[PDB]
Curated annotation (Swiss-Prot), chain B:
This is Vesicle-associated membrane protein 2. One of its GO terms (biological process) is vesicle-mediated transport. Nervous system specific. A higher level expression is seen in the brain as compared to the spinal cord. Expressed in hippocampal neurons. Involved in the targeting and/or fusion of transport vesicles to their target membrane. Major SNARE protein of synaptic vesicles which mediates fusion of synaptic vesicles to release neurotransmitters. Essential for fast vesicular exocytosis and activity-dependent neurotransmitter release as well as fast endocytosis that mediates rapid reuse of synaptic vesicles. Modulates the gating characteristics of the delayed rectifier voltage-dependent potassium channel KCNB1. The record marks 31-33, 39-40, 49-50, 54-55 as: (Microbial infection) Cleavage. It is found in: Cytoplasmic vesicle, Secretory vesicle, Synaptic vesicle membrane; Cell membrane. It comes from Rattus norvegicus (Rat). It is a single-pass type IV membrane protein. Residues 4-64 form the v-SNARE coiled-coil homology domain.
Swiss-Prot record, chain C:
Neurons of the neocortex, hippocampus, piriform cortex, anterior thalamic nuclei, pontine nuclei, and granule cells of the cerebellum. It is found in: Cytoplasm, Perinuclear region; Cell membrane; Synapse, Synaptosome; Photoreceptor inner segment. This is Synaptosomal-associated protein 25. Changing residue 14 to A: Decreased cleavage by C.botulinum BoNT/C, no change in cleavage by C.botulinum BoNT/A (botA). The chain holds residues 139 to 204 of 206 of the full protein.
UniProtKB/Swiss-Prot annotation, chain D:
The chain holds residues 192 to 250 of 288 of the full protein. It comes from Rattus norvegicus (Rat). Phosphorylated by CK2. (Microbial infection) Targeted and hydrolyzed by C.botulinum neurotoxin type C (BoNT/C), which hydrolyzes the 253-Lys-|-Ala-254 bond. Cleavage inhibits neurotransmitter release. Residues 1-59 form the t-SNARE coiled-coil homology domain. Expressed predominantly in cerebral cortex, hippocampus, cerebellum, adrenal medulla and retina with weak expression detected in non-neuronal tissues. The keyword Oxidoreductase does not apply. It is found in: Cytoplasmic vesicle, Secretory vesicle, Synaptic vesicle membrane; Cell membrane; Synapse, Synaptosome. Part of the SNARE core complex containing SNAP25, VAMP2 and STX1A; this complex constitutes the basic catalytic machinery of the complex neurotransmitter release apparatus. The SNARE complex interacts with CPLX1. Interacts with STXBP1. The interaction with STXBP1 promotes assembly of the SNARE complex. Interacts (via C-terminus) with KCNB1 (via C-terminus); the interaction increases in a calcium-dependent manner and induces a pore-independent enhancement of exocytosis in neuroendocrine cells, chromaffin cells, pancreatic beta cells and from the soma of dorsal root ganglia (DRG) neurons. This is Syntaxin-1A. One of its GO terms (cellular component) is SNARE complex. Belongs to the syntaxin family.
Swiss-Prot record, chain E:
The keyword Lyase does not apply. GO terms for molecular function: lipid binding; SNARE binding; syntaxin-1 binding. Binds to the SNARE core complex containing SNAP25, VAMP2 and STX1A. Signal peptide: none annotated. Nervous system. Strongly expressed in brain, where it is predominant in neurons from cerebral cortex and thalamus (at protein level). Positively regulates a late step in exocytosis of various cytoplasmic vesicles, such as synaptic vesicles and other secretory vesicles. Organizes the SNAREs into a cross-linked zigzag topology that, when interposed between the vesicle and plasma membranes, is incompatible with fusion, thereby preventing SNAREs from releasing neurotransmitters until an action potential arrives at the synapse. Also involved in glucose-induced secretion of insulin by pancreatic beta-cells. Essential for motor behavior. One of its GO terms (cellular component) is dendrite. It comes from the Eukaryota. Residues 1-33 form a coiled coil. Belongs to the complexin/synaphin family. This is Complexin-1.
């Protein structure tokens, strides 16, 4: 049955190699997805600053409306 | 050997732990953004109305700069 | 040391290498998410302050149109 | 065959762990792209809010 | 007079603007929970 055991160890060795090939592919997409995520966080972070800058302007302008409004 | 396999497995469980935390943080980001999207939309609606009131007010007190 | 016995080794060596990059990105990710989460909070308190002044300047504004 | 029997399980155990990490990286990216939809609706509304207010006090 | 009829228009329009954003939020939370289960959170 050495024949049997051998044909068995070969099958499991072939599958272990197959597994590492998939691991590589999986880890590659992950890296790809990760880089894509860091890029969108950057792009969105800039959007957030522009939004915050807009809140600051609105704040400044409302003081003027308040100043004007009172002066009536 | 396992001298490298167990090492690799270990460094995977860590990146998994770190990412599950990150996923928890982006879900907070998700809720905050959802709230801000509501707030900024009300804000645009409220500013729009204020601009119409001001326009009327300026016509009413047309001698005021 | 076979053609495929080496593929098994190199595949793993490369996987472990890439996992190192992933770890580094997972750390940037979270630090960026945190910074931004605080900024989104600050931005909502600001929007809340602005909303109020606008809801109020509007009342006064409207009362004078009578 | 024993060393081969177990080592193989280890190998798959690792792959499965990697399937999970892959999952999270993919979902994280989907989430940030999704959240980006809200962010430019927010940026759009604030941009108009800014302009409506500038007009309100700039006569 | 005919002005209060407007404040009504406005108040009801906001109850609706807020309704449309409350439905959006629930739909987001469902996906958030889905992701939560998926990873144990
Ligand atoms: Mg930034
Ligand atoms: Mg709107």
């Amino acid at each position: 049955s050495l024949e049997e055991m051998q044909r068995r160890a070969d099958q499991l060795a072939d599958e272990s190699l197959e597994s590492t090939r998939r691991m590589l592919q999986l880890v590659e997409e992950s890296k790809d997805a990760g880089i894509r995520t860091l890029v969108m966080l950057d792009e969105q972070g800039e959007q957030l600053d522009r939004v915050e800058e807009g809140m600051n302007h609105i704040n400044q302008d409302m003081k003027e409306a308040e100043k004007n409004l009172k002066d009536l | 050997s396992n001298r490298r396999l167990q090492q690799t497995q270990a460094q995977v469980d860590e990146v998994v732990d770190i990412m599950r935390v990150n996923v928890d943080k982006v879900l907070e980001r998700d809720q905050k953004l959802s709230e801000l999207d509501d707030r900024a939309d009300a804000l645009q609606a409220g500013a729009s109305q204020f601009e119409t009131s001001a326009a009327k007010l300026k016509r009413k007190y047309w001698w005021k700069n | 040391g076979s053609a495929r016995e080496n593929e098994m080794d190199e595949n793993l060596e490369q996987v472990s290498g890439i996992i190192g990059n992933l770890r580094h990105m997972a750390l940037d990710m979270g630090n960026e998410i945190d910074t931004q989460n605080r900024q989104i909070d600050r931005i909502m308190e600001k929007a809340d302050s602005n909303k109020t002044r606008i809801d109020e300047a509007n009342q006064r504004a409207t009362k004078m149109l009578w | 065959l024993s060393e081969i029997e177990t080592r193989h399980s280890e190998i798959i155990k690792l792959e499965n762990s990697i399937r999970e990490l892959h999952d999270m990286f993919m979902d994280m990216a989907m989430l940030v792209e999704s959240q980006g939809e809200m962010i430019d609706r927010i940026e759009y509304n604030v941009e108009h809010a800014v302009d409506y207010v500038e007009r309100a006090v700039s006569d | 007079k005919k002005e209060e009829e407007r404040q009504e228009a406005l108040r009801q329009a906001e109850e609706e603007r807020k309704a449309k954003y409350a439905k959006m939020e629930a739909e987001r939370e469902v996906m958030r929970q889905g992701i939560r289960d998926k990873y144990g959170i």
